[PDB]
Design a protein around this nucleic acid. Structure first.
Length: 51
DNA sequence: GGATTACACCCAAGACACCAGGCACGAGACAGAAAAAAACAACGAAAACGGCCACCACCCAAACACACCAAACACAAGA
């Protein structure tokens, strides 16, 4: 708790219960912790290996 | 080494320090530092033995001369 800075944020989130498919999608979500500090468009790109 | 990286708006969710060694006071012990005395240097006073002038005699130094040897112009030889 005392190291909230330098800790990953948003690893836990409030489950989305607006509709059923939103819940099913939130339970299957993934996150790359690149951060928005940086305009490198490469890791944002759909890649061949994503198939 | 720092410093900057769209603009506006909506919603939800959690916390809004707890707990542990330092300042003061709280008391011992060798070290930060102070007091003393005894073997350290010198100087005053007495004792007698080492130092200076005689006396003295035998051993080294100088003179005389010896024969002996090293040596130096030159009459002769020589290329």
């Amino acid at each position: 708790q005392k190291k909230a800075m330098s800790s990953r944020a948003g690893v836990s989130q409030v489950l989305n219960r607006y509709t059923y498919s939103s819940t099913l999608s939130h339970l299957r979500r993934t996150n790359t912790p690149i951060g928005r500090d940086g305009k490198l468009a490469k890791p944002r790109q759909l890649h061949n290996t994503h198939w």
